Amino acid sequence: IKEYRLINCNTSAITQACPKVSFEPIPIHYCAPAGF
Amino acid sequence: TLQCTNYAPFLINELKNCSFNMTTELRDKKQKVYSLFYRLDVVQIKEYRLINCNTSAITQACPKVSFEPIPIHYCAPAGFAILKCKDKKFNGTGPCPSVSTVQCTHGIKPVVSTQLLLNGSLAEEEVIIRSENITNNAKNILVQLNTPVQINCTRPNNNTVKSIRIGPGQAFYYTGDIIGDIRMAHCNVSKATWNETLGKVVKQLRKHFGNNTIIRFAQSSGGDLEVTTHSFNCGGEFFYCNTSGLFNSTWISSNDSITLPCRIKQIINMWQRIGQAMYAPPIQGVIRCVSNITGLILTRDGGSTNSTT
Amino acid sequence: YVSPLSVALGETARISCGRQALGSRAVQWYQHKPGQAPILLIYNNQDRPSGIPERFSGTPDINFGTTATLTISGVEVGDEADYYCHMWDSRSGFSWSFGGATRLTVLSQPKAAPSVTLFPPSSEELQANKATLVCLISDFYPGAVTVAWKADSSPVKAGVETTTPSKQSNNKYAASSYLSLTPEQWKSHKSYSCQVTHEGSTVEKTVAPT
Amino acid sequence: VQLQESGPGLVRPSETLSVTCIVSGGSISNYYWTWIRQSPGKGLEWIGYISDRETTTYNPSLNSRAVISRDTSKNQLSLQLRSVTTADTAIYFCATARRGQRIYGVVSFGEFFYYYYMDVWGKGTAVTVSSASTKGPSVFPLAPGGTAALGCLVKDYFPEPVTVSWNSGALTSGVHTFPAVLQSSGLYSLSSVVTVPSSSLGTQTYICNVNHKPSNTKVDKKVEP
Ligand SMILES: *[C@@H]1O[C@H](CO)[C@@H](O[C@@H]2O[C@H](CO)[C@@H](O[C@@H]3O[C@H](CO[C@H]4O[C@H](CO[C@H]5O[C@H](CO)[C@@H](O)[C@H](O)[C@@H]5O[C@H]5O[C@H](CO)[C@@H](O)[C@H](O)[C@@H]5O)[C@@H](O)[C@H](O[C@H]5O[C@H](CO)[C@@H](O)[C@H](O)[C@@H]5O)[C@@H]4O)[C@@H](O)[C@H](O[C@H]4O[C@H](CO)[C@@H](O)[C@H](O)[C@@H]4O[C@H]4O[C@H](CO)[C@@H](O)[C@H](O)[C@@H]4O[C@H]4O[C@H](CO)[C@@H](O)[C@H](O)[C@@H]4O)[C@@H]3O)[C@H](O)[C@H]2NC(C)=O)[C@H](O)[C@H]1NC(C)=O
Ligand SMILES: *[C@@H]1O[C@H](CO)[C@@H](O[C@@H]2O[C@H](CO)[C@@H](O[C@@H]3O[C@H](CO[C@H]4O[C@H](CO)[C@@H](O)[C@H](O)[C@@H]4O)[C@@H](O)[C@H](O[C@H]4O[C@H](CO)[C@@H](O)[C@H](O)[C@@H]4O[C@H]4O[C@H](CO)[C@@H](O)[C@H](O)[C@@H]4O[C@H]4O[C@H](CO)[C@@H](O)[C@H](O)[C@@H]4O)[C@@H]3O)[C@H](O)[C@H]2NC(C)=O)[C@H](O)[C@H]1NC(C)=O
Ligand SMILES: *[C@@H]1O[C@H](CO)[C@@H](O[C@@H]2O[C@H](CO)[C@@H](O[C@@H]3O[C@H](CO)[C@@H](O)[C@H](O[C@H]4O[C@H](CO)[C@@H](O)[C@H](O)[C@@H]4O[C@H]4O[C@H](CO)[C@@H](O)[C@H](O)[C@@H]4O)[C@@H]3O)[C@H](O)[C@H]2NC(C)=O)[C@H](O)[C@H]1NC(C)=O
Ligand SMILES: *[C@@H]1O[C@H](CO)[C@@H](O[C@@H]2O[C@H](CO)[C@@H](O[C@@H]3O[C@H](CO)[C@@H](O)[C@H](O[C@H]4O[C@H](CO)[C@@H](O)[C@H](O)[C@@H]4O[C@H]4O[C@H](CO)[C@@H](O)[C@H](O)[C@@H]4O)[C@@H]3O)[C@H](O)[C@H]2NC(C)=O)[C@H](O)[C@H]1NC(C)=O
Ligand SMILES: *[C@@H]1O[C@H](CO)[C@@H](O[C@@H]2O[C@H](CO)[C@@H](O[C@@H]3O[C@H](CO)[C@@H](O)[C@H](O[C@H]4O[C@H](CO)[C@@H](O)[C@H](O)[C@@H]4O)[C@@H]3O)[C@H](O)[C@H]2NC(C)=O)[C@H](O)[C@H]1NC(C)=O
Ligand SMILES: *[C@@H]1O[C@H](CO)[C@@H](O[C@@H]2O[C@H](CO)[C@@H](O[C@@H]3O[C@H](CO)[C@@H](O)[C@H](O[C@H]4O[C@H](CO)[C@@H](O)[C@H](O)[C@@H]4O)[C@@H]3O)[C@H](O)[C@H]2NC(C)=O)[C@H](O)[C@H]1NC(C)=O
Ligand SMILES: *[C@@H]1O[C@H](CO)[C@@H](O[C@@H]2O[C@H](CO)[C@@H](O)[C@H](O)[C@H]2NC(C)=O)[C@H](O)[C@H]1NC(C)=O
Ligand SMILES: *[C@@H]1O[C@H](CO)[C@@H](O[C@@H]2O[C@H](CO)[C@@H](O)[C@H](O)[C@H]2NC(C)=O)[C@H](O)[C@H]1NC(C)=O
Ligand SMILES: *[C@@H]1O[C@H](CO)[C@@H](O[C@@H]2O[C@H](CO)[C@@H](O)[C@H](O)[C@H]2NC(C)=O)[C@H](O)[C@H]1NC(C)=O
Ligand SMILES: *[C@@H]1O[C@H](CO)[C@@H](O[C@@H]2O[C@H](CO)[C@@H](O)[C@H](O)[C@H]2NC(C)=O)[C@H](O)[C@H]1NC(C)=O
Ligand SMILES: *[C@@H]1O[C@H](CO)[C@@H](O)[C@H](O)[C@H]1NC(C)=O
Ligand SMILES: *[C@@H]1O[C@H](CO)[C@@H](O)[C@H](O)[C@H]1NC(C)=O
Ligand SMILES: *[C@@H]1O[C@H](CO)[C@@H](O)[C@H](O)[C@H]1NC(C)=O
Ligand SMILES: *[C@@H]1O[C@H](CO)[C@@H](O)[C@H](O)[C@H]1NC(C)=O
């Protein structure tokens, strides 16, 4: 503003990522339906 | 709790200037800010509170969205169909001789309105009276005009808005102090055209009550504030118009435009919704909307003595 | 209360209103000259009474965000005066106050020289056991003057009472100084003098017992 | 229309001041009328007014000490101020007042206001609030470019004002009555001079008419060299 604040608190709200989920990208196949 | 005073130089007229604390974006830190409320939104215990806070929770309408009704077509899926009656003199149920079919209706504007119907479709030929049990008073009466009357509705007050941040990301838009004169919202209706329209309606009305019977018009006298008034939306603001000027007549055997008073509320529960209410955000600048009155909704006072009044 | 304004002669003066109206307004402009009756110059924001010269004008209330102003074109020495702006608007209420006065001074106003007339005590006043020397100073501009009395060659410090200069009906200033003596003091000195210094220049008049 | 004030000119502290205003050349019955004062080192203060219906309204800052009336039978406006103090010393002006309407919107929504303006005024009357009695002025002649100077000393009078005239009309100019001096005694003294032809001297005549209405006193002085 020693006093501080989080960067985000004036721009937007915040939520904590769940610990369990992983951000390790895995191959994904995009499929089109039948007839396409 | 709101600490409020009346405006202070009110010669002949209600809206109140309030001050209050507010949570800022940091949880721990607070701010003292002030806002202007139309006195319908607040009640006392000078200390005040919002009307809604004991009945229900509240949420603020996003500023971006517009409440300006656009035509919507209702469509039926394939294998089904919509039948459309094109009978001009169609009295509200019955066999329709001239019928056409469509997969989708025409553009129907979802105009949220009370008492008088706005920006709608006009009946051709004679004005049309539609009910469900004409001898019954409990069931309302639908009127469709053949000629639309023109109604000009304005909020003259120069409303200024400020933006106070009350939490992370959250931002409340509050009504700043008015700049310039304090004038009340109103609606004008040409007295000539409204007298013609009122004449033509009673002509078609007497078709159901024998022929020189006394047909008078009185004000609404039942129910809550939100129902007794011509409630609608205009530019963003919600108008509650008192319609005493029009329905003060009796029928037997210059411009002079009528003027109608309108109050403004920013906290609203329409369609009898008790639960999550909405705060209509203040609208910057002067408001003026020109609208059509295409229909009406009437009600009897009771079993009448029949050919008496 | 006084708000000073100075304007060069023959140019256009613009006097702002002391108050800015909360709501749509009716403003009146009064001209007040010291010792005379106030004059209505403008009423209803822009309207001029018969006889008021079209030199004065006010700002019309068209609802534009514009302050009440008084315009005087071709400002003359005769426009030196106080100007009050009586402000009526819709959110103030009944306005009892006239507001403060804008004191208008006209300027590059030539530097006229003072005229000085010194009168000895009357024969009657001396028989009445009193004596007063009367120094009259008129027709000067600007209004600042210094008056000193002398007895012979030395300065009298007291017995002297002097009026503050004020503008007369020819737009120039006038003041008077009175030195009261006893008759024996009057006959005591060879001569008394009234010395007036205006704008650095000093002139003097003299009288003697006879 | 013409307005001329009349007054006491001296009022003891804690007494009731009274001033009157005669109107000529227009009917009293059809107009509003008002009082305004000027106190020394202050501005013009609006006291209050009277309507055509003879209803009165007053500035709160007078604290109900003021009463304004009308007497149509004498065409005269009047004012009394009770319980005066030295701050009530002032020149007191009577004026006409016109009502105007400033309308910004709808009449029925009350979207209009009234304002008043004073279009015709009196000269004023000086009224002083002081303990002492009226004191008459001893007047003394002041003896005489081709011109000489001539004058009258008006010494030690109370209170203001003094009128000075010369021969009535004939000596109109060039005659100058100076502002008075307020003595440390609290007495007032002024002087009035006129510029005359040296040749006129000894053949002509000049006297000054000195009026002290508060005294009241009256005198004339023949000035001679
Ligand atoms: C729904 O319907 C509602 C009603 O059905 C409707 O409500 C209406 O709203 C409007 C505004 O939207 C309102 O309009 C206002 O009307 C005011 C009054 O207008 C009338 O009176 C004036 C003045 O007349 C008096 O003075 C003259 C002097 O010459 C005399 O000759 C007259 O006899 C008269 O004196 C009598 O009345 C006095 C009291 O007022 C008494 O004390 C006195 O004893 C006498 O009895 C007339 O001039 C007007 O005529 C003019 O306008 C009409 C149209 O209305 C024209 O046809 C006509 O040709 C003329 O042009 C009229 O009869 C207006 O004063 C007001 O306008 C002023 O205010 C606004 C803002 O507040 C300003 O922006 C504007 O500039 C105007 O200010 C001028 O005047 C003031 C005050 O005098 C000045 O101080 C100011 O500086 C300014 O002067 C400038 O402009 C002048 C021209 O205007 C010019 O001359 C000057 O030189 C200078 O430049 C405003 O228009 C209306 O009243 C409402 N209706 C009702 C019933 O209340 C609503 O809007 C509808 N809703 C919709 C459509 O959505
Ligand atoms: C019956 O039918 C009739 C006929 O349709 C209806 O009458 C119409 O009613 C309309 C809505 O009620 C009304 O529309 C409004 O008109 C305003 C004025 O129009 C003028 O400008 C346009 C160009 O934009 C011209 O073409 C036109 O000729 C006029 O000159 C508009 O300004 C209105 O738009 C604003 O309001 C709507 C909400 O209604 C917003 O969605 C829109 O974004 C605008 O809001 C922005 O601008 C205002 C200006 O003051 C700001 O205050 C506000 O915060 C917004 O600003 C933000 O957004 C902008 C843009 O992203 C951004 O730049 C800025 O920084 C801010 O972030 C609106 O369009 C019609 O005029 C009216 N018809 C006629 C002929 O008068 C009648 O309502 C119907 N009856 C009923 C009961 O509904
Ligand atoms: C919520 O809070 C966060 C953090 O608290 C905000 O993020 C910060 O936002 C501020 C301003 O919004 C920003 O500060 C500017 O950064 C710029 C880029 O680094 C700088 O260029 C800029 O400097 C100019 O402005 C200064 C005054 O603030 C001047 O002192 C300086 O001289 C600069 O001015 C020059 O340049 C301009 C433009 O060319 C010119 O007009 C001038 O004449 C002059 O020549 C500021 O320092 C921070 O960088 C942001 N912080 C971070 C960590 O990114 C966030 O914006 C807030 N949220 C909202 C919605 O506002
Ligand atoms: C949340 O708060 C809001 C606002 O704070 C509440 O809205 C208000 O609700 C109250 C009561 O619920 C209501 O007050 C009544 O309004 C009625 C209609 O206007 C009045 O008729 C009624 O008066 C009767 O009761 C008074 C005592 O309260 C008596 O003094 C008075 O004489 C009346 O009594 C007569 O009539 C009855 C019935 O016929 C009879 O039995 C008696 O013998 C006597 O003859 C109250 O004043 C307010 O009008 C509401 N406010 C607004 C602005 O609408 C809301 O209800 C609260 N929420 C919940 C869930 O309760
Ligand atoms: C509706 O109520 C709100 C309350 O939040 C109100 O906002 C406040 O109004 C008061 C009015 O007194 C403002 O206070 C004034 O502020 C100015 C500028 O700082 C001062 O100069 C003022 O002082 C003068 O007046 C005093 C009166 O007693 C004198 O004693 C003093 O000597 C000065 O002459 C005065 O303190 C205050 O600033 C606002 N608050 C904010 C945050 O703006 C609002 O004005 C009310 N609505 C209306 C139409 O009045
Ligand atoms: C409701 O009230 C608000 C007051 O909060 C009012 O907003 C003001 O409106 C005027 C326009 O009428 C704005 O004035 C302009 O502002 C812009 C941006 O600052 C300037 O560029 C403009 O300058 C022009 O005009 C000048 C006139 O002297 C010229 O000299 C110049 O060269 C430009 O041509 C002009 O000053 C004003 O800024 C706003 N104020 C705010 C705080 O927004 C609004 O008008 C009212 N609503 C309605 C519908 O009237
Ligand atoms: C509209 O008018 C028609 C008349 O053509 C009404 O139809 C009759 O209604 C009565 C009762 O009111 C029935 O007993 C008849 O059988 C109906 N006649 C026919 C020919 O169908 C119709 O009820 C009216 N609608 C309303 C809402 O009043
Ligand atoms: C309100 O009513 C007016 C007529 O009073 C409508 O204006 C007409 O609109 C139709 C389109 O439906 C045009 O064909 C006409 O030419 C218009 N009339 C005139 C005189 O030009 C107006 O559309 C109606 N507003 C609505 C329904 O919002
Ligand atoms: C509603 O507003 C419209 C337009 O602002 C008004 O139409 C005006 O009517 C007058 C005659 O009464 C005409 O002189 C104008 O030319 C019309 N304006 C336009 C733009 O065409 C209408 O009269 C208003 N309705 C009421 C009840 O006052
Ligand atoms: C709408 O306006 C009418 C004015 O016509 C109001 O009616 C008055 O109501 C009071 C009681 O509240 C009665 O004593 C009066 O006799 C009524 N006036 C007239 C002229 O009959 C009415 O209250 C207003 N409605 C609302 C909801 O404010
Ligand atoms: C804001 O909170 C403080 C308590 O710290 C309170 O004294 C004050 O009255 C509040 N503000 C208003 C407008 O009531
Ligand atoms: C509807 O009207 C009929 C006609 O006589 C009447 O018998 C019936 O009771 C009414 N229904 C209701 C619900 O009032
Ligand atoms: C009522 O008036 C209409 C229109 O003139 C007429 O057709 C009808 O016969 C009248 N009804 C009676 C019962 O007289
Ligand atoms: C409206 O009703 C009131 C109350 O009886 C009446 O005084 C007034 O004349 C009515 N207005 C009209 C236009 O009939």
Numbering used by the authors:
A (entry chain G): 184, 189 to 223
B (entry chain G): 128 to 140, 153 to 184, 189 to 309, 312 to 321, 321A, 322 to 397, 410 to 465
C (entry chain L): 5 to 8, 11 to 66, 66A, 66B, 66C, 67 to 95, 95A, 95B, ...
D (entry chain H): 2 to 82, 82A, 82B, 82C, 83 to 100, 100A, 100B, 100C, ...
Lines from the paper:
To ascertain whether stabilized, PGT121 germline-targeting trimers maintain native-like structure, we conducted crystallography and electron microscopy (EM) studies. For higher resolution analysis, we solved a 4.5 Å resolution crystal structure of MD39-10MUTA, a variant of MD39-10MUT with one mutation added and another removed (see Supplemental Experimental Procedures), complexed with 35O22 and PGT124 (Garces et al., 2014, Sok et al., 2013). Although this resolution precluded analyses of side-chain conformations, and the interface between trimer and PGT124 could not be analyzed due to missing V1 loop density, the structure accurately determined the backbone positions for most (1,659 of 1,692) residues of gp140. We conclude that MD39-10MUTA, with 20 mutations relative to BG505 SOSIP T332N, retains an overall native-like conformation. Finally, mutations from Rare3, MD16, and MD33 were combined to produce MD39 with 11 mutations (F223W and T290A did not improve the biophysical properties of the trimer and were excluded; data not shown). Compared to BG505 SOSIP.D664, the MD39 yield improved by a factor of ∼7, Tm increased by 10°C, and antigenic profile improved, with reduced V3 Ab reactivity and similar bnAb binding except for slightly reduced affinities for V2 apex bnAbs. Combining the MD39 mutations with germline-targeting mutations produced germline-targeting trimers with improved properties. MD39-10MUT had a 6-fold-improved yield and 6°C higher Tm as compared to 10MUT. The MD39 mutations improved the structural uniformity of the 10MUT trimer; the amount of flexible, native open conformations dropped from 35% to 5% between 10MUT and MD39-10MUT (see the Experimental Procedures for a description of the 2D classification system). To improve this affinity further, we screened a gp120 V1- and V3-loop saturation mutagenesis library for binding to GLCDR3mat; combining the most enriched mutations (N137F, T320F, and Q328M) with 7MUT produced 10MUT, with KD ≈1 μM for GLCDR3mat.
Broadly neutralizing antibodies (bnAbs) against the N332 supersite of the HIV envelope (Env) trimer are the most common bnAbs induced during infection, making them promising leads for vaccine design. Wild-type Env glycoproteins lack detectable affinity for supersite-bnAb germline precursors and are therefore unsuitable immunogens to prime supersite-bnAb responses. We employed mammalian cell surface display to design stabilized Env trimers with affinity for germline-reverted precursors of PGT121-class supersite bnAbs. In summary, we have developed stabilized native-like trimer immunogens for germline-targeting and boosting of glycan-dependent PGT121-class bnAb responses against HIV.
